[PDB]
């Protein structure tokens, strides 16, 4: 009945953690562990897996290799197990398609069937009081059939990923199927049509290229408030900001200096597009100048000031900061390629009375009444750096959280 650890989510963060726990098991004893994921059939951002979607990190930053290249869960071992390693080598790329990395993640996760529970959404975590002290946590979940489940645990790891960021102007249109966040792209995309894409980062660029390449009757407008698509910085000195060593460095810094570092290196990860994809998009617009056929529009320096549902489509009032002018365009669909927030608090709401920043070891600081350990993954960019929301340091974070957990449970 009483688990050692329950995890919210079984994406890369918690899969990497399950591996690190398994490595420690022989020397330190196997723990009683469950990871719950709301997806019935696990995919890694499955509704974003368009034909042109390259991984934006080296395959060597897989779930294990930075810690343990001899792990059977390395991307290289995965290829070898699928009789594909020589073929992959002939490709000569560090960047597999995201569809292949999705297959890799599913393959790794399929080794943890005793620990995973799919189709279970965690709704809230409650304190189990015993003589005034929180000795355990109640994890309340709902399965796909709508049944409630209640489980008990000594420790919790919260790794639910981000939530879609919706600009305020589009909030009134929640529930209108014509407006959707890029995270649901494939679900909604599944006859001359006009589609607006809001944003100018990697997701907006991928959405645009997919429309251009696969939906010949779609006229796409990239609507971005910034002046240009700008390239993602992965040059090698800059890229050291993702190294495991940087985690210690940023954590050691005072708050003003942490914020300065994050501002300085913002363009390694946010509001930026892979250089080759920028060149591809620029080429699409350049060819329109050659042909005189303006299928698509690049609306830079443009802000959506109003968005209204009409019988004819979604009407957007567009302010061009270059000219100060307002125009009105109507679209058949609007894709919000506007990224994600990391906040996660109905989940942890019943524990608000006991909470504090996060520790170096990713443990939420609680007052002395709380005897249980709660960890969170992907919510600590402010203190641990730009690797926090990415695949970048997962093998090392997994070793760090798993170490701390054993130390706590000893
Ligand atoms: C489109 C896209 C592309 C990306 N590409 C890259 C890339 O190329 N390289 C890179 O390094 N990073 C990339 N990222 C960053 C991404 O955050 C990480 O790669 C990684 O997915 C984070 O792992 P995670 O397990 O912390 O979160 P997630 O992968 O988001 O997993 C969270 C899991 O929690 C589950 N969940 C959420 N709420 C609940 C609930 N309450 N109960 C139960 N389960 C729940 C979800 O079903 C999900 O499976 C990308 C992100 C996106 C959105
Ligand atoms: C992978 O690849 C990812 C790329 O991420 P991504 O493209 O999904 O997200 P992102 O880099 O955060 O891009 C978000 C895009 O949405 C735009 N945006 C956000 N809020 C907006 C608003 N309120 N109004 C108008 N535009 C808004 C941003 O524009 P601004 O730059 O103008 O904020 C940016 O172009 C990395 O973050 C990593 O996880
Ligand atoms: N350049 C980073 C990954 C950045 C991913 N951003 O989308 C790294 O090498 O860890």
Curated annotation (Swiss-Prot):
SUPFAM superfamilies: FAD/NAD(P)-binding domain
Pfam families, per the entry: Lys_Orn_oxgnase
GO molecular function: ornithine N5-monooxygenase activity
Catalytic activity field: L-ornithine + NADPH + O2 = N(5)-hydroxy-L-ornithine + NADP(+) + H2O
Keyword annotations of the record: Cell inner membrane, Cell membrane, FAD, Flavoprotein, Membrane, Monooxygenase, NADP, Oxidoreductase
Subcellular compartments: Cell inner membrane
Cofactor(s) recorded in Swiss-Prot or TrEMBL: FAD
Entry keyword annotation includes ATP-binding: no
pH influence on activity: Optimum pH is 8.0-8.5.
Domain of life: Bacteria
An example Gene Ontology biological process: pyoverdine biosynthetic process
Listed InterPro entries: FAD/NAD-bd_sf (IPR036188), Lys/Orn_oxygenase (IPR025700)
Family to which this protein belongs: Belongs to the lysine N(6)-hydroxylase/L-ornithine N(5)-oxygenase family.
Functional summary from the UniProt entry: Catalyzes the conversion of L-ornithine to N(5)-hydroxyornithine, the first step in the biosynthesis of all hydroxamate-containing siderophores, such as pyoverdin. Pyoverdin is a hydroxamate siderophore composed of a 6,7-dihydroxyquinoline-containing fluorescent chromophore joined to the N-terminus of a partly cyclic octapeptide (D-Ser-L-Arg-D-Ser-L-N(5)-OH-Orn-L-Lys-L-N(5)-OH-Orn-L-Thr-L-Thr in strain PAO1). Specific for NADPH, which plays a role in stabilization of the C4a-hydroperoxyflavin intermediate.
The name this protein goes by in its record: L-ornithine N(5)-monooxygenase
Source organism of the structure: Pseudomonas aeruginosa (strain ATCC 15692 / DSM 22644 / CIP 104116 / JCM 14847 / LMG 12228 / 1C / PRS 101 / PAO1)
Lineage, broadest ranks: Bacteria, Pseudomonadati, Pseudomonadota, Gammaproteobacteria, Pseudomonadales
Gene field: pvdA
């Amino acid at each position: 009945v009483v688990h050692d650890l329950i995890g919210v989510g079984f994406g890369p963060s918690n899969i990497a953690l399950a591996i690190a726990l398994q490595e420690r098991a022989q020397a330190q004893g196997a723990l009683e562990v469950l990871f719950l994921d709301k997806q019935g059939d696990y995919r890694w951002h499955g509704n974003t897996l368009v034909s042109q979607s390259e991984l934006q990190i080296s395959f060597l930053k897989d779930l294990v290799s930075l810690r343990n290249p001899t792990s059977p869960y390395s991307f290289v071992n995965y290829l070898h197990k699928h009789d594909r390693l020589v073929d992959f080598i002939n490709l000569g790329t560090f960047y597999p398609c995201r569809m292949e990395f999705n297959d890799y993640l599913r393959w790794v996760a399929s080794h943890f069937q005793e620990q995973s529970r799919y189709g279970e959404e965690v709704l809230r975590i409650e304190p189990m009081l015993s003589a005034g002290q929180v000795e355990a946590l109640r994890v309340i979940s709902r399965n796909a059939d709508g049944e409630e489940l209640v489980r008990t645990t000594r420790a919790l790891v919260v790794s639910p990923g981000g939530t879609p960021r919706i600009p305020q102007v589009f909030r009134a249109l929640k529930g209108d199927g014509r407006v959707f966040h890029h995270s649901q792209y494939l679900e909604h995309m599944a006859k001359p049509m006009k589609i607006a894409i809001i944003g100018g980062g990697q997701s907006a660029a991928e959405a645009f290229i997919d429309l251009n390449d696969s939906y010949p009757s779609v006229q796409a407008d990239m609507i971005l408030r910034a002046s240009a698509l700008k390239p993602a910085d992965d040059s090698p000195f800059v890229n050291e900001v993702f190294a495991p060593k940087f985690t210690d460095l940023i954590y050691s810094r005072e708050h003003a200096e942490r914020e300065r570092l994050l501002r300085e290196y913002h363009n390694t990860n946010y509001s930026v597009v892979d250089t080759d994809l920028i060149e591809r998009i620029y080429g699409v617009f350049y060819r329109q100048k050659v042909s005189g056929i303006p299928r698509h529009a690049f609306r830079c320096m443009t802000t959506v000031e109003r968005a209204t549902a009409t019988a004819q489509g979604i009407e957007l009032a567009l302010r061009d900061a270059g000219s100060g002018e307002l125009s009105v365009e109507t679209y058949d669909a609007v894709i919000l390629a506007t990224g994600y927030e990391r906040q996660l608090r109905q989940l942890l709401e019943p524990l608000a009375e006991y909470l504090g920043e996060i520790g170096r070891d990713y443990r939420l600081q609680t007052d002395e009444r709380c005897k249980v350990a709660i960890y969170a993954q992907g919510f600590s960019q402010a203190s641990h750096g730009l690797s926090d929301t990415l695949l970048s340091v997962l093998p090392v974070r997994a070793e760090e959280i798993s170490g701390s957990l054993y130390q706590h449970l000893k």
